[PDB]
Amino acid sequence: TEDFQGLRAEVETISKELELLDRELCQLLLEGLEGVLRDQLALRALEEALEPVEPLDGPAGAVLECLVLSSGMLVPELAIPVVYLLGALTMLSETQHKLLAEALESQTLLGPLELVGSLLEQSAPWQERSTMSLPPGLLGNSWGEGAPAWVLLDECGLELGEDTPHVCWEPQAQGRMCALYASLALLSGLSQ
């Protein structure tokens, strides 16, 4: 029960809600996010930081300094966009986690978003099995087993094959794909 225009629009509006962060808050945030993706100490310390905050060290602390005023108070229109993000991460594998981190410290956020975006917009709709043919330029340097675009989708539960074919959409990939989409998306937006 979703069309991807809802998803994209839903994720788009949240993407704008973090446009508040100016420069350092913008590049210090995704810096400290990049920690919790390769480190669970921060992922689970940040997830439990929210639920009147106090100071925190390390990577999860780097994300709290953007959300808080001079008391412990989190700004709701800021704090919620990130809670929406960490949930999208709860869905992903830890392998997908390390990859996001690895795509982050490179320009390579936008490429896969365009790839996930097509495959999501191609699967018509998210329930029925779909044929889902692969976009030409977005599959990476050498596409195949180890390829960082392969294990992204593969760890969403997609059955893939070698000579640039389509890939059968199994609706069980929806939340992992919608989450890989949405997380890819928010991150690239802050890169901007």
mmCIF file of C-alpha atoms in Angstrom:
data_model
loop_
_atom_site.group_PDB
_atom_site.id
_atom_site.type_symbol
_atom_site.label_atom_id
_atom_site.label_comp_id
_atom_site.label_asym_id
_atom_site.label_seq_id
_atom_site.Cartn_x
_atom_site.Cartn_y
_atom_site.Cartn_z
ATOM 1 C CA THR A 1 0.000 0.000 0.000
ATOM 2 C CA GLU A 2 2.303 2.727 -1.330
ATOM 3 C CA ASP A 3 3.250 4.190 -4.700
ATOM 4 C CA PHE A 4 6.824 5.597 -4.178
ATOM 5 C CA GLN A 5 5.573 9.075 -4.994
ATOM 6 C CA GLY A 6 4.282 9.063 -1.441
ATOM 7 C CA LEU A 7 7.589 7.618 -0.248
ATOM 8 C CA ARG A 8 9.688 10.131 -2.211
ATOM 9 C CA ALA A 9 7.437 13.014 -1.179
ATOM 10 C CA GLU A 10 7.362 11.755 2.430
ATOM 11 C CA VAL A 11 11.158 11.527 2.489
ATOM 12 C CA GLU A 12 11.495 14.786 0.528
ATOM 13 C CA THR A 13 9.659 16.862 3.131
ATOM 14 C CA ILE A 14 11.783 15.466 5.958
ATOM 15 C CA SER A 15 14.870 16.152 3.836
ATOM 16 C CA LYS A 16 13.892 19.844 3.837
ATOM 17 C CA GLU A 17 13.284 19.782 7.611
ATOM 18 C CA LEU A 18 17.051 19.315 8.123
ATOM 19 C CA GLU A 19 17.902 22.136 5.717
ATOM 20 C CA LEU A 20 17.844 24.302 8.854
ATOM 21 C CA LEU A 21 21.374 23.107 9.672
ATOM 22 C CA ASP A 22 23.625 25.723 8.189
ATOM 23 C CA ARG A 23 27.179 24.676 7.513
ATOM 24 C CA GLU A 24 29.022 23.136 10.450
ATOM 25 C CA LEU A 25 25.834 21.603 11.837
ATOM 26 C CA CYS A 26 25.314 20.261 8.324
ATOM 27 C CA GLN A 27 28.806 18.788 7.849
ATOM 28 C CA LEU A 28 29.343 17.930 11.530
ATOM 29 C CA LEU A 29 26.068 15.987 11.594
ATOM 30 C CA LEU A 30 26.709 13.600 8.700
ATOM 31 C CA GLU A 31 30.209 13.333 10.120
ATOM 32 C CA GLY A 32 28.809 11.958 13.389
ATOM 33 C CA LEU A 33 26.150 9.897 11.652
ATOM 34 C CA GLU A 34 28.982 8.226 9.712
ATOM 35 C CA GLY A 35 30.280 7.023 13.071
ATOM 36 C CA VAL A 36 27.158 5.192 14.240
ATOM 37 C CA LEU A 37 26.881 3.262 10.951
ATOM 38 C CA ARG A 38 30.241 1.521 11.433
ATOM 39 C CA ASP A 39 29.853 1.499 15.236
ATOM 40 C CA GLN A 40 26.963 0.061 17.225
ATOM 41 C CA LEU A 41 28.074 1.790 20.461
ATOM 42 C CA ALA A 42 26.896 5.002 18.854
ATOM 43 C CA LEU A 43 23.906 3.561 16.960
ATOM 44 C CA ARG A 44 22.404 2.180 20.158
ATOM 45 C CA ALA A 45 23.611 5.126 22.285
ATOM 46 C CA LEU A 46 21.976 7.573 19.872
ATOM 47 C CA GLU A 47 18.734 5.566 19.544
ATOM 48 C CA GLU A 48 18.449 5.580 23.343
ATOM 49 C CA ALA A 49 19.619 9.195 23.630
ATOM 50 C CA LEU A 50 16.154 10.104 22.342
ATOM 51 C CA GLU A 51 13.404 8.863 24.746
ATOM 52 C CA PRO A 52 15.909 16.532 28.333
ATOM 53 C CA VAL A 53 19.215 15.151 26.894
ATOM 54 C CA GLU A 54 22.619 15.451 28.521
ATOM 55 C CA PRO A 55 26.131 15.625 26.969
ATOM 56 C CA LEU A 56 27.453 12.566 25.124
ATOM 57 C CA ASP A 57 30.952 11.820 23.847
ATOM 58 C CA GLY A 58 32.021 10.306 20.548
ATOM 59 C CA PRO A 59 29.957 9.914 17.379
ATOM 60 C CA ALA A 60 26.464 9.872 18.884
ATOM 61 C CA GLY A 61 27.359 13.077 20.721
ATOM 62 C CA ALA A 62 28.230 14.708 17.403
ATOM 63 C CA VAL A 63 24.621 14.253 16.263
ATOM 64 C CA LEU A 64 23.127 15.614 19.485
ATOM 65 C CA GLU A 65 24.935 18.981 19.259
ATOM 66 C CA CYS A 66 22.899 19.830 16.157
ATOM 67 C CA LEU A 67 19.520 19.009 17.741
ATOM 68 C CA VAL A 68 19.787 20.723 21.118
ATOM 69 C CA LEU A 69 19.523 24.183 22.662
ATOM 70 C CA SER A 70 21.594 25.364 25.650
ATOM 71 C CA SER A 71 19.598 23.100 27.987
ATOM 72 C CA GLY A 72 19.138 19.449 27.163
ATOM 73 C CA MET A 73 16.190 20.324 24.947
ATOM 74 C CA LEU A 74 15.930 18.665 21.563
ATOM 75 C CA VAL A 75 14.277 20.737 18.859
ATOM 76 C CA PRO A 76 11.301 18.652 17.654
ATOM 77 C CA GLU A 77 11.401 19.625 13.966
ATOM 78 C CA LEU A 78 15.098 18.639 14.041
ATOM 79 C CA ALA A 79 15.104 15.601 16.349
ATOM 80 C CA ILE A 80 12.210 13.896 14.535
ATOM 81 C CA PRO A 81 13.857 13.909 11.063
ATOM 82 C CA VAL A 82 16.739 11.966 12.613
ATOM 83 C CA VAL A 83 14.461 9.516 14.464
ATOM 84 C CA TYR A 84 12.877 8.859 11.074
ATOM 85 C CA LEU A 85 16.382 8.075 9.842
ATOM 86 C CA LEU A 86 17.591 5.757 12.621
ATOM 87 C CA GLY A 87 14.417 3.732 12.125
ATOM 88 C CA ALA A 88 15.264 3.308 8.451
ATOM 89 C CA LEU A 89 18.615 1.998 9.703
ATOM 90 C CA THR A 90 16.967 -0.453 12.193
ATOM 91 C CA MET A 91 15.641 -2.233 9.077
ATOM 92 C CA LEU A 92 18.981 -2.551 7.313
ATOM 93 C CA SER A 93 21.646 -5.153 7.803
ATOM 94 C CA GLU A 94 24.892 -4.243 9.508
ATOM 95 C CA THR A 95 26.572 -4.896 6.152
ATOM 96 C CA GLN A 96 24.297 -2.342 4.496
ATOM 97 C CA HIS A 97 25.225 -0.175 7.478
ATOM 98 C CA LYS A 98 28.975 -0.281 6.839
ATOM 99 C CA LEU A 99 28.341 0.409 3.137
ATOM 100 C CA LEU A 100 26.281 3.560 3.774
ATOM 101 C CA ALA A 101 29.142 4.781 5.946
ATOM 102 C CA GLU A 102 31.539 3.929 3.138
ATOM 103 C CA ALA A 103 29.460 5.677 0.469
ATOM 104 C CA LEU A 104 29.218 8.690 2.798
ATOM 105 C CA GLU A 105 32.832 9.779 2.926
ATOM 106 C CA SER A 106 32.723 9.776 -0.884
ATOM 107 C CA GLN A 107 30.513 11.582 -3.406
ATOM 108 C CA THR A 108 28.816 8.223 -3.963
ATOM 109 C CA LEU A 109 25.626 8.909 -2.014
ATOM 110 C CA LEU A 110 23.677 10.096 -5.075
ATOM 111 C CA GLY A 111 24.483 7.256 -7.479
ATOM 112 C CA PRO A 112 22.738 4.418 -5.636
ATOM 113 C CA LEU A 113 19.810 6.609 -4.621
ATOM 114 C CA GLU A 114 19.131 6.976 -8.358
ATOM 115 C CA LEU A 115 19.450 3.178 -8.691
ATOM 116 C CA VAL A 116 17.264 2.301 -5.696
ATOM 117 C CA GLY A 117 14.897 5.066 -6.796
ATOM 118 C CA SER A 118 14.361 3.495 -10.231
ATOM 119 C CA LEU A 119 13.944 -0.047 -8.978
ATOM 120 C CA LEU A 120 11.443 1.253 -6.423
ATOM 121 C CA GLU A 121 9.568 3.331 -9.008
ATOM 122 C CA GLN A 122 9.732 0.449 -11.477
ATOM 123 C CA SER A 123 8.209 -2.189 -9.185
ATOM 124 C CA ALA A 124 4.555 -1.664 -9.926
ATOM 125 C CA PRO A 125 3.229 -1.629 -7.247
ATOM 126 C CA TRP A 126 5.117 -2.687 -4.147
ATOM 127 C CA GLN A 127 2.985 -5.825 -3.638
ATOM 128 C CA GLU A 128 2.744 -7.727 -6.941
ATOM 129 C CA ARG A 129 5.865 -9.506 -8.206
ATOM 130 C CA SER A 130 7.422 -7.261 -10.803
ATOM 131 C CA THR A 131 9.992 -7.703 -13.547
ATOM 132 C CA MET A 132 12.037 -4.581 -12.662
ATOM 133 C CA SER A 133 14.720 -4.046 -15.378
ATOM 134 C CA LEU A 134 18.099 -2.550 -14.173
ATOM 135 C CA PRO A 135 19.215 0.998 -15.137
ATOM 136 C CA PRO A 136 22.315 1.176 -17.360
ATOM 137 C CA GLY A 137 24.830 3.515 -15.812
ATOM 138 C CA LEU A 138 24.126 3.148 -12.124
ATOM 139 C CA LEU A 139 25.468 -0.377 -11.388
ATOM 140 C CA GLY A 140 29.094 0.545 -10.536
ATOM 141 C CA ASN A 141 32.640 -0.062 -11.798
ATOM 142 C CA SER A 142 32.454 -3.852 -12.088
ATOM 143 C CA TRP A 143 28.972 -5.155 -11.254
ATOM 144 C CA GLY A 144 28.843 -8.600 -9.655
ATOM 145 C CA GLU A 145 29.253 -10.503 -6.386
ATOM 146 C CA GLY A 146 31.305 -8.128 -4.248
ATOM 147 C CA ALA A 147 29.985 -4.952 -5.865
ATOM 148 C CA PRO A 148 28.776 -2.388 -3.281
ATOM 149 C CA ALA A 149 25.537 -1.959 -5.224
ATOM 150 C CA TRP A 150 24.942 -5.729 -5.282
ATOM 151 C CA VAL A 151 24.989 -6.436 -1.539
ATOM 152 C CA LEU A 152 22.878 -3.336 -0.939
ATOM 153 C CA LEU A 153 19.982 -4.857 -2.865
ATOM 154 C CA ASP A 154 20.982 -8.429 -2.000
ATOM 155 C CA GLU A 155 20.707 -7.681 1.708
ATOM 156 C CA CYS A 156 17.250 -6.325 0.940
ATOM 157 C CA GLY A 157 16.502 -9.844 -0.256
ATOM 158 C CA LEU A 158 16.753 -9.494 -4.046
ATOM 159 C CA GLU A 159 17.569 -12.369 -6.372
ATOM 160 C CA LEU A 160 20.083 -11.015 -8.854
ATOM 161 C CA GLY A 161 21.864 -12.339 -11.930
ATOM 162 C CA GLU A 162 24.894 -11.584 -13.993
ATOM 163 C CA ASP A 163 24.388 -10.244 -17.493
ATOM 164 C CA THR A 164 22.571 -6.939 -16.694
ATOM 165 C CA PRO A 165 19.101 -8.504 -16.580
ATOM 166 C CA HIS A 166 15.992 -7.443 -14.764
ATOM 167 C CA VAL A 167 15.555 -8.566 -11.154
ATOM 168 C CA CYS A 168 12.323 -9.998 -9.778
ATOM 169 C CA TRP A 169 10.760 -7.693 -7.232
ATOM 170 C CA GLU A 170 9.670 -9.677 -4.202
ATOM 171 C CA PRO A 171 7.447 -7.405 -2.058
ATOM 172 C CA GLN A 172 9.332 -8.635 1.038
ATOM 173 C CA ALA A 173 12.120 -6.216 0.021
ATOM 174 C CA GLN A 174 9.788 -3.235 0.472
ATOM 175 C CA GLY A 175 10.737 -2.056 3.947
ATOM 176 C CA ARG A 176 14.426 -2.746 3.426
ATOM 177 C CA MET A 177 14.293 -1.027 0.032
ATOM 178 C CA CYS A 178 12.070 1.838 1.180
ATOM 179 C CA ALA A 179 14.477 2.137 4.100
ATOM 180 C CA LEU A 180 17.576 1.924 1.890
ATOM 181 C CA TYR A 181 15.988 4.484 -0.412
ATOM 182 C CA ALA A 182 14.924 6.810 2.377
ATOM 183 C CA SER A 183 18.237 6.589 4.270
ATOM 184 C CA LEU A 184 20.257 7.020 1.084
ATOM 185 C CA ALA A 185 18.037 10.017 0.333
ATOM 186 C CA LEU A 186 18.278 11.930 3.620
ATOM 187 C CA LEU A 187 22.061 11.504 3.635
ATOM 188 C CA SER A 188 22.638 12.769 0.117
ATOM 189 C CA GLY A 189 20.454 15.768 0.951
ATOM 190 C CA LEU A 190 22.755 16.851 3.768
ATOM 191 C CA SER A 191 25.774 16.240 1.574
ATOM 192 C CA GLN A 192 24.262 18.987 -0.631
#
